[PDB]
Structures are given as C-alpha cells and as structure tokens.
Design a protein around this ligand. Structure first.
Ligand SMILES: N#C/C(=C\c1ccc(O)cc1)C(=O)NCCN1CCOCC1
Length: 456
C-alpha cells in the first residue's frame, strides 16, 4: 500500500533469488501487496543481472537503504503533485479527473527522447518507461495515493486502467503501437465496440492487486542480448510464477500460465504439472473467464507442439487460434496478431511441412485430419477478413497456401468431407466456401486458388 513496514524491512537485504521470493511470498500474504516496493526490487535485480559477466555465482544485493530511498522518491513525486482535496472521492470511487491527473503526473515525468525499462526502478532512476510500464506506473501511483479501486487492465497487446465499482470505468493511460493518435483519458468503449483483437471484445483482464503482482512477474525480461538470457532472472521468474500459481493468483491469467509452461519446458521443476497440463490450464482459464476469446492460449500450445514436432497437434492448435480470430474484425492497431498469423501461415507452417516431407523421402502429410486442420486454419483467417476495415490476405499468402496444400497428395486430401456452412469439416468464410473443390483436386490449380484467396 503506502509506507514500508518492519515486516518488509526485516526481510532485507535481499542477497539471493530465494530472498526475493520470500519477500514476494510475504507481500502476497497481505490483503494489499505493495506494488511500488515489489516493482523497485524486481527492477533493481533485473538491472544488475541483465548484463554479461565473469563469475559463476553473482547476485546484486538489494540493500534496504537503496530500495527505501527510491521508494521515498516515488512516493514523494506522486503525493507532491496530486492534491487529493481538489478531487471529490465519493463512495470509495476515484473520479476520472483524479485518474487522469495521476496519469498525467507519470506521463509528464518521462524523458522526451527498448529492454529493461518496464519497472518503477527504470522510472525513478532514468525517467524511462515502456508502454505497459506507464500503465503499471499509473496503478502503483494510485495505490500509493490510497485509491483502492484503480486497477490494471490488460488485453493480449495493450494495457490501461479500470476503476469505480467492479472496474466499470475505463481510461487509456499509455500509448500503443507507433504512429497512432493519443487516446489517453478516453474510455476503451470504442475499441470494445469495433470488435478489434486489441480490446478482445471486452473479454480482457481486470486485475486485482495480486494479479498486478503476477503482471510485474510476467514483465521480468531475462534477455541480456540477442543470444543470451540471464539464467538467474529466468529462475526468479519461474519461482515467482509457481508462488503465484500455488496461491491461486494465476487462475484468471492465461498468459501467465503459458509463460509458466514455457519456463517448465525450458527446465522442468520436479513434482510440478508438465508443460502440456499448464498450457491446457491456460486454455481452460480463457474458456472459463474470458469467453474463449483469447488467441495466445492456443498460440502457446501450438508453439510447444511445433518445437516437439507433434505436427498434428500443432496444426490443430493453430486452427484453434484461427477459429477464435474469425469472430473479430481486423482493425488498424491489431498488427501484432496479424504479424503472428502471417508468420504462422507463410513461414512456420511451410517449414514444418517441408521438414515433414523430407522425412517421408527417407506421415502427417498422410493424415487427412492434419489436412482438415490446415483447412480450418485458412478458413478462420478468411472469415476474420470478412467485415474487417482493412484487408488481410494478399498474393504472398497465396504463394504459401498452395505450397502447403501441395505437401498433401490428392489421395490424402480427397478423404475430407468439406461442407459449406449454412474427417468432416464445415467452412464459414466465403473464400474457402468458394474454392472448396479446388482444395481436393488431384492437380492443385495454383492460379484459381491464388485468385480466389486474393478476391475482395
Ligand atoms: N508477443 C507476444 C506475447 C505472447 C505470445 C507470442 C507468441 C506465442 O506463440 C504465444 C504467446 C505476449 O504475451 N506479449 C505481451 C503481451 N502484453 C499484453 C499487455 O501489454 C502489451 C503486451
């Protein structure tokens, strides 16, 4: 909340990964974990671990004196710029005016001209923050001001704040993407209503304080350079996520579960659920709390199957991402999910299939199920295009669809009972409904298919 207590101070100095975990375990026991304290600690240890080094054992000691000084500087900066008497706080509800005031305080503090600028350590010592860092900084400043209703909101690619009863009020506080006009101060209602992926049709995360702790743990960046990760930061993140997991605080956080699965794939913790179980918990969480309208739970699972060369389950998981995206409209700030679908369609899937082909020269290319999955994937992309502001498919997509269908013999392909929506498979998009017979011809007509995919 506000002000360091002896129950925290007594756990300093933090001389190890396990010392940090112990501080987090104690903070998560309290009704209201201190976001400013935890973010400064993570930012301090990350700052000094994210560098190449000589020396087998190293841990940068977080002395209480340096953490409490940075804490006091943050707390003074915010209390000293925000007079709460000028803001009626009726009913335990912050006003949009107050919320935008705190956001402006943070905003006006940032430098005017990358990695490891996500924490309040970065804010206080270098006045630099990345996009979701700003939003987290606004929530921490509000907690420092006693505004118990201001919370972090997160989609799969953006962050803002919610407040009021049950977080019914929303406010943009940070930037998104590169050249877009500032929306700070506005509600997210337009983004929800335009059906963009960026705002998840309203099925976005609304954090309590413990989920905000989970967010800052997911925000740890172990990357030192393009070829190197800090093993210490990976281990710290993995232990903190298991701590959050055990306390139930990842229950409504699919991306944290996927992150935890990836970490367990990297180095499994003895006695813990295996990565596959964790990926499916993330999917279960998205189905339970978020109407199965998230993309990444299936993208996480697909990547895992891809790495493990389970071609069938990878394709199925990728088709699932497309079955989710088909209900959205592609909008002008949804580029990241476009880039991902693009890469999957025109890079990952072709190479995975090329690797499969090279193997039969010396078996999923013979699975009709696998071909069904590939069709369902492309049908979702086409249906996604329908009703969308900007076009999705283009000639590049066309080149690799035909190349990927070619990896299946007409013998294989002919065993799938394609059905126009009005292994058996039903189509929902006009384009795929269109060229359905073309997908099963013993001779793929490249030009026809290429044409119908690129149609308006
Ligand atoms: N890119 C990516 C991410 C995940 C991913 C990518 C590929 C996969 O195959 C599976 C998962 C990811 O979650 N990024 C951070 C999301 N934040 C949301 C709040 O603020 C904006 C950033």
């Amino acid at each position: 909340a506000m002000g360091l207590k002896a129950a925290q101070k007594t756990l300093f100095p933090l001389r190890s990964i396990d010392d940090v975990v112990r501080l987090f375990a104690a903070e998560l026991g309290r009704e209201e974990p201190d976001l400013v304290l935890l973010s400064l600690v993570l930012g301090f240890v990350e700052h000094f671990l994210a560098v190449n080094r000589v020396g087998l054992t190293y841990f940068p000691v977080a002395d209480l004196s340096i953490i409490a000084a940075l804490y006091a500087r943050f707390t003074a900066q915010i209390r000293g710029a925000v007079d709460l008497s000028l803001y009626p706080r009726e009913g335990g509800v912050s006003s949009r005016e107050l919320v935008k005031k705190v956001s402006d305080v943070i905003w006006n503090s940032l430098s005017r001209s990358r990695a490891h600028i996500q924490s309040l350590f970065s804010f206080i010592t270098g006045t630099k923050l990345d996009s979701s860092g700003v939003a987290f900084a606004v929530v921490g400043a509000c907690q420092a001001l006693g505004l118990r209703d201001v919370h972090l909101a997160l989609s799969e690619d953006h962050a803002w704040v919610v407040f009021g009863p049950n977080g019914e009020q929303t406010a943009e506080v940070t930037w998104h993407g590169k050249g877009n006009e500032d929306r700070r101060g506005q509600t997210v209602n337009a983004g929800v209503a335009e059906r963009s992926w960026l705002y998840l049709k309203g099925s976005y995360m609304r954090c309590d304080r413990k989920m905000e702790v989970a967010f800052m743990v997911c925000a740890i960046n172990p990357s030192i350079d393009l070829h190197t990760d800090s093993l210490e930061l990976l281990q710290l993140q993995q232990k903190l996520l298991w701590l959050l997991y055990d306390l139930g605080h990842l229950e409504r956080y699919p991306m944290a579960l996927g992150n935890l699965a990836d970490l367990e794939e990297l180095e499994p913790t003895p006695g813990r659920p295996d990565p596959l179980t964790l990926y499916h918990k993330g999917i279960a969480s998205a189905k339970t709390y978020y109407r199965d309208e998230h993309i990444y739970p299936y993208m996480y699972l697909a990547g895992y199957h891809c790495r493990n060369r389970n071609v069938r389950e990878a394709l199925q998981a990728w088709a699932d991402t497309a079955t989710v995206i088909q209900d959205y409209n592609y909008c002008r700030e949804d580029e990241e999910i476009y880039k991902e679908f693009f890469e999957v369609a025109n890079d990952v899937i072709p190479n995975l299939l090329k690797e499969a082909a090279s193997l039969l020269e010396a078996s999923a290319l013979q699975d009709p199920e696998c071909f069904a999955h590939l069709l369902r994937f492309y049908d979702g992309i086409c249906k996604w295009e329908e009703g969308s502001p900007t076009p999705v498919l283009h000639v590049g997509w066309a080149t690799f669809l035909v190349q990927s269908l070619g990896r299946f013999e007409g013998q294989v392909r002919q065993k799938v009972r394609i059905v126009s929506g009005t292994p058996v498979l039903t189509f929902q998009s006009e384009k795929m409904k269109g060229m359905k017979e073309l997908l099963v011809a013993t001779k793929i007509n490249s030009s026809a298919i290429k044409l119908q995919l690129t149609a308006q």
